[PDB]
């Protein structure tokens, strides 16, 4: 010199990243799923479906996970490590 709005979790955002779901060494891995966090423990999950019409459609979940989520990160093979002020938990998408 435009900005697009996608989903809107109602609660604040903490973490954005990506995962390699369906993991069937190289550093740049071509990520299949997309991940975002809410705080009050809304998790957003996205994937490519291409199902029932033979056309790409975005498969959304919205999970409601326990605990006020403080921080998270991604590990090898569709795994996310996140934390509640109780416990450090893990999630397998794979």
């Amino acid at each position: 010199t435009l900005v697009k709005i996608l989903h809107h979790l109602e609660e604040p955002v903490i973490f954005i990243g990506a995962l390699k779901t369906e993991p069937q060494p190289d550093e740049d891995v071509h990520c299949d799923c997309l991940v975002a966090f809410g705080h009050h423990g809304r998790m957003l999950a996205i994937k490519a479906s291409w199902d029932e019409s033979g056309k790409l459609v975005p498969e959304l979940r919205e999970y409601c996970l326990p605990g006020p989520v403080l921080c998270a990160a991604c590990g090898g093979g569709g795994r996310v490590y996140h934390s509640t002020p109780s416990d450090l938990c893990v999630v397998d998408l794979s």
Binding site: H7, H8, E52, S53, L60
Partner: protein, 370 residues
């Protein structure tokens, strides 16, 4: 009702006219014990050709790849009534496909009552309970001292409906489930099924210890047939009646037709000298006047007991059974392999559902009966 004054309320209770001219409806829609937000603005007249339909972002998630379907439905639909009938029918479809998001248990009935009924059993029994508590697995002992498991799968209401009962043993397991019946009821039924086979398991464990079992390999409790080997390159397959196991089983012989003849002939002489006081083995040894070898497995670890056409054991359930009537070849084969060999060649000559031909390895007369 006929009119959507009353039929609208009667079908969508949760649709409240904000504006005076009934033009903005808002509030909710019901759907599989699940109410959702809705904000459905009409134009200055009642037209759905132009209408704004905004949602919860939760609702956008569940109307994934029907955005166009419902856009069609808005322009082709007569009334708002009919639109809502369709939007409900449609949600029900979307969610019943996405049916992997649902099912909360009733905690005041379930978790406790399940802890209660497992206390009724005793804690030494339980071997597995799933983290959804949906599956559990339980243990019982025979009078012999054999472990018999039972898998259960549980519904949202365990005590109301039957839990799905899965168990190895061969006769079909029957569990008289009432809403009053419990884990202890079905456990007693399980012990009843164990003891009706108690003699049966002993006869089978006896055969499995003392004889070269061939063709169940680590047999389950479900197997009633036992392909025993005897000498080498002849076998006997044995189906036993589980209610009369010590009693005479239907038994017959595989191998070379010159070796099977005296064995069948001596079984026919000595089948009246069967006695159900002895074991199955202690009657077969005196009927057929033989011993059984103890696992010619470990010495004959590669004798190539493979088809010698395709060179595999286990082609599609079939075993190497068809052999040569020759001392110098003795080469086993399969039904499929030997048939696709003897039909392909010129020399081969078929009577009705038999092929006579030459053994591939030694070129001697070999007979195949389909």
């Amino acid at each position: 009702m006929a009119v959507t004054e009353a039929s609208l309320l009667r079908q969508c209770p949760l649709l409240l006219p904000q504006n005076r001219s009934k033009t903005v409806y808002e509030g909710f829609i019901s759907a599989q014990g699940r109410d959702f937000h809705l904000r459905i603005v009409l134009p200055e007249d009642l037209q759905l050709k132009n209408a704004r339909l905004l949602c919860s972002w939760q609702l956008r998630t569940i109307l994934s790849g029907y955005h166009r379907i419902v856009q069609q439905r808005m322009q082709h639909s007569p009334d708002l009534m009919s639109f809502m009938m369709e939007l409900k029918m449609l949600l029900e479809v979307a969610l019943k496909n996405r049916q992997e998001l649902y099912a909360l248990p009733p905690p005041p009935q379930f978790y406790s009552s399940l802890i209660e009924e497992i206390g009724t059993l005793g804690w030494d029994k339980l071997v597995y309970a799933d983290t959804c508590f949906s599956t559990i697995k339980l243990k019982a002992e025979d009078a012999s001292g054999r472990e018999h498991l039972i898998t259960l799968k549980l519904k949202a209401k365990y005590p109301a409906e039957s839990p799905d009962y899965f168990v190895d043993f061969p006769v079909p397991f029957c569990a008289s489930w009432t809403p009053q019946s419990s884990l202890i009821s079905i456990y007693s039924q399980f012990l009843a099924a164990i003891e009706s086979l108690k003699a049966f398991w002993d006869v089978m464990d006896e055969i499995d210890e003392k004889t070269w079992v061939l063709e169940p390999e680590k047999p389950p409790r479900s197997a009633t047939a036992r392909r025993i080997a005897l000498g080498n390159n002849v076998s006997i397959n044995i189906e036993v009646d589980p209610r009369h196991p010590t009693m005479l089983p239907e038994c017959f012989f595989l191998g070379a037709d010159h070796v099977v003849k005296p064995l069948g002939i001596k079984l026919s002489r000595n089948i009246h000298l069967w006695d159900p006081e002895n074991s199955v083995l202690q009657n077969l040894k005196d009927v057929l006047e033989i011993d059984f070898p103890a696992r010619a497995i470990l010495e004959k670890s590669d004798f190539t007991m493979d088809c010698g056409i395709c060179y595999a054991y286990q082609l599609d359930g079939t075993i190497p059974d068809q052999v040569c009537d020759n001392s110098q070849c003795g080469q086993p084969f399969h039904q499929i392999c030997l048939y696709e060999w003897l039909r392909g060649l010129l020399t081969s000559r078929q009577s009705f559902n038999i092929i006579f031909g030459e053994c591939p390895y030694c070129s001697k007369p070999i007979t195949l009966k389909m």
